[PDB]
């Protein structure tokens, strides 16, 4: 479907390398396949910590039978685009709203 924020089959280390770029504003993000569980995905986002510096938080996106995806079971979605659209307007669990697509 070609969404710029979707990187697919990249490792976690690859996702942190892209997100830990110093030019990324807080809330920069991407969605990728889980590097550990077949069928699962992940939302990786950038944030800053005074003591340690730039950091990346990873959220496991579970994919149901069934269709559907969710970070927390109380807020579910029919697709990955719907999930990103939502969190792009409401943190609702996240430390911050998804602010910017991570540059490829």
């Amino acid at each position: 479907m070609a969404e710029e924020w979707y990187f697919g089959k990249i490792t976690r280390r690859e996702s942190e390398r892209l997100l830990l770029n110093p030019e990324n504003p807080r809330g920069t993000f991407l969605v990728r396949e889980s590097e550990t569980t077949k069928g699962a995905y992940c939302l990786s986002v950038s944030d800053f910590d005074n003591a340690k510096g730039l950091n990346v938080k990873h959220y496991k996106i579970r994919k149901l039978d069934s269709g559907g995806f969710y970070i927390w079971s109380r807020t579910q979605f029919s697709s990955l685009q719907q999930l990103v659209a939502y969190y792009s307007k409401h943190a609702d669990g996240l430390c911050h709203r998804l602010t910017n697509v991570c540059p490829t």
């Binding site: 992940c42 938080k57 990873h58 959220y59 496991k60 970070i71 927390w72 669990g93």
Partner: peptide
């Protein structure tokens, strides 16, 4: 290491 997964 995922924020939403305790275990």
């Amino acid at each position: 290491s995922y924020v939403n997964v305790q275990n």
